[PDB]
A and B are shown apart, each in its own frame.
Chain A
Amino acid sequence: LFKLDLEDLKQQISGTRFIGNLSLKIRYVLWQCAID
């Protein structure tokens, strides 16, 4: 039954919008760690 869950995972990670949001979140966590 995990095939529909894998297709729902592929439905929510494909495209330009998700990887750029990840690039914003990792920049947030790097600057938040390096704030001091």
Chain B
Amino acid sequence: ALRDFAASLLDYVLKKFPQAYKSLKPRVTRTLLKTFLDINRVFGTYYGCLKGVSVLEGESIRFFLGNLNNWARLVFNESGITLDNIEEHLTKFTKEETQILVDTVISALLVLKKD
């Protein structure tokens, strides 16, 4: 609840201050790209990162299209899998939070295919 509230407070300050654009849009998306692109973080930081990606818009979300495949291949361990035993295969997370991640990674991906 706090991640979903603070993510919708970041979008409030990207519109309250549009005169500071190109001075807190690339800074915040660089913070999110820096915090997101690793393996050794806890699940909630990844959830906050993806919701902060969701409260951005446009090509910046497309800017995270390329580096999502290797992110999934490192954080979800599909080492040669054939998508069949996915319910009881995986290693860091539990099943519920992996389902939350696969839900939220397309909750923001719908913005790039609706235009």
Interface of A toward B, CB cutoff 8 Å: 16-17, 20-21, 23-25, 27-28, 31-32, 35-36
Are A28's CB and B34's CB within 8 A? yes
Q: 15 A–B contact pairs at CB < 8 A?
A: A20-B39, A21-B38, A21-B40, A21-B74, A23-B70, A24-B38, A24-B67, A24-B70, A24-B74, A25-B37, A25-B38, A31-B63, A31-B66, A35-B26, A35-B30
Pair B39/A28 contact, Cβ less than 8 Å: no
CA–CA, A36 and B27, complex, Å: 12
Which residue of chain A is the closest to B36 with respect to CB atoms?
A28
Chain A contact residues, majority secondary structure: helix
**A-B contact number at CB 8 A:** 41
A17 to B26, CA, bound (A): 29
- Count contacts on B: residues with CB < 8 A to the other chain: 17
Residues B12-69 near A (CB distance < 8 A): 26, 29-30, 33-34, 37-40, 63, 66-67
Chain B residues near A32 (CB-CB < 8 A): 30, 33-34
